[PDB]
Amino acid sequence: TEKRGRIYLKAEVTDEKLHVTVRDAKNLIPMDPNGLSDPYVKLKLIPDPKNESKQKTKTIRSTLNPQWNESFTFKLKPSDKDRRLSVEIWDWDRTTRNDFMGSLSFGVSELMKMPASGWYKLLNQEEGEYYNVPIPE
Ligand SMILES: [Ca+2]
Ligand SMILES: [Ca+2]
């Protein structure tokens, strides 16, 4: 909800597993010639040097206010204490590289001391890997 729009999420750590719900997003930035985008969300635990934690929602065509309503589960291990949940919205493009739309992240430990829930401001790509900005109201 500021330049790159906002996203509604839920994420809690229930003994063993991290549960994430990606509800919807609003006011996303136009990344297509038609003035829209084809948004999908990529969920990842970072760092992910082996590149194995990737999960993704379906792609919704031609919209800036997608409603995915999809949930995901990551098995956690003691090694994940220092990892973060990365949430990135991307714009599916058929004839070129997919465009970045907005992102954010949560510390696994952070989520364990308080599950995330509600609206969050979409951040730039690099910075999105470092923090999140909740939007109460
Ligand atoms: Ca595009
Ligand atoms: Ca597109």
Ligand SMILES: [Ca+2]
């Ligand atoms: Ca592109």
